Amino acid sequence: GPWADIMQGPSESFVDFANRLIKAVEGSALPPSARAPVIIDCFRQKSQPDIQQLIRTAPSTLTTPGEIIKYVLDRQ
Hints:
mainly alpha; monomer; capsid protein; alpha-helical bundle; Non-ribosomal Peptide Synthetase Peptidyl Carrier Protein, Chain A; about 60% helix; viral protein
């Protein structure tokens, strides 16, 4: 899938990567209920190492892409 190769550049902001990623997922053939967990997983696995390490500190109660986005942005 198109979204599957998207990775955050070492010079790219997290929110720019998130926006690209989400656009690719929304435009893909994934069914609607698969989008959010795919997005979350890509945030966790495909962001820059420092961001991956920040995301993994988030409480398990943060479950939506929007919650992770704000978690990351609010800590920059």
